[PDB]
């Protein structure tokens, strides 16, 4: 009768060549691969342990740093390995981040360098330019010889100087055009080919503590004042647009490159506030993991990540959609973080602290900069979801969430939980008897008032 049996062809499974790769038969019958749910979990848990192994954020420091505390970091938005820094010594440096060496160093200003910005002045490849301002009441334009291209072969040094009636405290440059804005006692609009301020913008008599041009609607400008105010400006109208007064001053402002109407604010009240430019009566998001005043804030060019440099000697990385830091970077070598900028590839973090060093940190502590094989790739992204999937697994939370934090920070953290708990208990006691006490939204407590109501 008819018989057939399982029959193996030896040549098919054992190659005739010694060098030919043996065939790997595969069957996706679910029964043949039992314990899915235990398995993926174990691969998840191993990944979290491995992630903490490779979490090696520090890479190095730029040269020998600055003499005094570094208080102005300006990044070249058109180049990866170009950075401009300045310290209270009055010295400004232009760095080759690739070689961790300085292109050039200038004793630019007699006083403290209060602002820096890299520009491409359109005077009416072989060189780059940067603009510096300080409290000595002058703004100077400098030119830097660079080795980016070899199509030529100098004139390296001061190019032009702008004198001002009052001290200059902040500077930002328009992206599309050569115009740039300075923030001092009055926020002034300047043109490169014009020695005196082209236009005068000001809400009122109050001074301006920082300014940041939008990266997308580059014609929009925002500023911060010493009166705990944030003022929005429009270049098409050449006038201020909106003002909101908050409970406590904001030190830095940055616009989300992926969301033009959306910007984050670095505040002194341990918080960074995420604001929509259209409706400022409330915030979009608030970030509360710092233990001292937040000095600087920056957006990822991917737009999904924000850092905040704080006076508490730590740098914290936040997701735009999550209000708590996923990561904390710190070192005893870092004395007071005043500036935190990104490598505009979104892969490295640049920090400036008053100890005089500008440090480089990995955005992703466990990621490595080397080119990986497809097999190396396919395994690494296999972990990141499998960690994402089982993120709230308690042991996965325990191993993943843990970070080494300085003792001053936790002793600051544990106490604020106590004052906050005292406030909630004591306020909650009033909910028992007080008939009319409105509930105050977290997103509106920081706002004291807005000029234009809607």
């Amino acid at each position: 009768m008819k018989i057939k049996t399982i029959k193996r062809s030896a040549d098919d499974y054992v190659p005739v060549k010694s060098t030919q790769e043996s065939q790997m038969p595969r069957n996706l019958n679910p029964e043949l691969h039992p314990f899915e749910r235990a398995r993926e979990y174990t691969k998840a848990l191993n990944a979290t342990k491995l992630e903490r192994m490779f979490a090696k954020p520090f890479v190095g420091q730029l040269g020998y740093g600055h003499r005094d505390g570094v208080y102005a970091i300006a990044k070249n938005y058109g180049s990866l390995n170009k950075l401009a820094t300045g310290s209270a010594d009055g010295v400004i440096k232009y760095w080759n981040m690739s070689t961790r060496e300085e292109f050039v160093s200038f004793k630019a200003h007699y006083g403290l360098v209060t602002g820096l910005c890299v520009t491409q002045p359109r005077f009416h490849k072989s060189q780059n330019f940067m603009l510096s301002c300080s409290d000595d009441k002058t703004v100077k334009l400098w030119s830097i010889n660079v080795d980016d291209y070899s199509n030529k072969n100098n004139e390296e040094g001061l190019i032009r100087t702008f004198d001002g009636e009052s001290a200059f405290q902040g500077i930002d440059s328009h992206r599309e055009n050569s115009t740039f804005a300075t923030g001092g006692a009055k926020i002034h609009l300047w043109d490169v080919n014009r020695l005196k301020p082209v236009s005068d913008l000001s809400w009122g008599a109050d001074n301006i503590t920082s300014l940041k041009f939008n990266q997308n609607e580059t014609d929009i400008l925002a500023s911060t004042g010493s009166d705990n105010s944030i003022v929005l400006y429009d270049l098409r109208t050449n006038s201020p647009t909106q003002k909101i007064v908050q409970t406590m001053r904001t030190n830095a402002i940055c616009w989300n490159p992926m969301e033009a109407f959306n910007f984050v604010t670095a505040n002194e009240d341990h918080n960074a506030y995420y604001y929509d430019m259209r409706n400022l009566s409330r915030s979009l998001n608030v970030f509360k993991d710092h233990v001292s005043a937040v000095m600087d804030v920056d957006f990822s060019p991917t737009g999904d990540e924000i850092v905040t440099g704080s006076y508490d000697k730590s740098i914290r990385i936040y997701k735009t959609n999550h209000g708590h830091s996923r990561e904390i970077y710190h070192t005893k070598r870092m004395q007071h973080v005043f500036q935190v900028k990104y490598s505009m590839d979104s892969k490295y973090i640049i920090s400036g602290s008053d100890d005089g060093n500008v440090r480089l940190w990995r955005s992703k502590a466990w990621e490595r900069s080397n080119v990986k094989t497809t097999r190396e790739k396919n395994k690494l992204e296999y972990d990141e979801k499998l960690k994402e999937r089982f993120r709230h697994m308690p042991e996965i939370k325990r191993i993943s969430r843990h970070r080494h934090v300085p003792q001053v920070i936790k002793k600051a953290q544990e106490i604020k939980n106590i004052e906050l708990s005292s406030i909630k208990r004591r306020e909650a006691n009033e909910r028992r008897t007080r008939k009319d006490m409105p509930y105050i939204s977290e997103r509106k407590k920081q706002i004291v008032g807005t000029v234009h109501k809607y």
Partner: protein, 162 residues
């Protein structure tokens, strides 16, 4: 921002295409420098696109004279034109800064790079040599370098069989 790399071989000129650009900030990191040594990693960075062998001994010397003086020979002008797109401006990696202005004069549409990043790629090509040529007939470089040696060095001194 590199796309094409010009490498000179004693047998001829080979231009390469940069498929992947190595991280510029982390250039000095341990792992990336190892990738230059590792052939498998490097082949992902670049690929051989062209090779133009010299016709004979005479061409190698007169090009060897021209490469040294930062000059562009007819062979260099010929090979580059067929490869680099007219195009904003195409970027070419050259080991020599002095050769850069010569290339720009003939070809206004190409911008030259000779920074350490370009040097890093050029070093790797020399490290592996004909292994990157993937079988293309380059004879063997070592004797060609040696053969071009008394061709090049010994020309400048003006001896004679006299």
């Amino acid at each position: 921002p590199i796309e094409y790399l010009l490498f000179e071989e004693p047998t001829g000129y080979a231009v390469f295409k940069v498929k992947l650009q190595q991280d510029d900030i982390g250039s000095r990191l341990k792992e990336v420098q190892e990738q230059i040594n590792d052939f498998g990693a490097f082949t992902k960075l670049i690929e051989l696109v062209s090779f133009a062998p010299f016709k004979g001994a005479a061409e190698a010397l007169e090009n060897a004279n021209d490469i040294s003086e930062g000059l562009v020979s007819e062979s260099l002008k010929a090979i580059l034109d067929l490869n680099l797109p007219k195009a904003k401006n195409i970027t070419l990696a050259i080991s020599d800064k002095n050769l850069g202005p010569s290339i720009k004069e003939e070809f206004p549409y190409v911008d030259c790079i000779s920074n350490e990043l370009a040097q890093d790629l050029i070093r790797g090509v020399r490290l592996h040599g004909e292994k990157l040529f993937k079988g293309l007939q380059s004879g063997d470089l070592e004797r060609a370098q040696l053969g071009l040696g008394h061709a090049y060095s010994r020309a400048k001194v003006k001896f004679s069989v006299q």
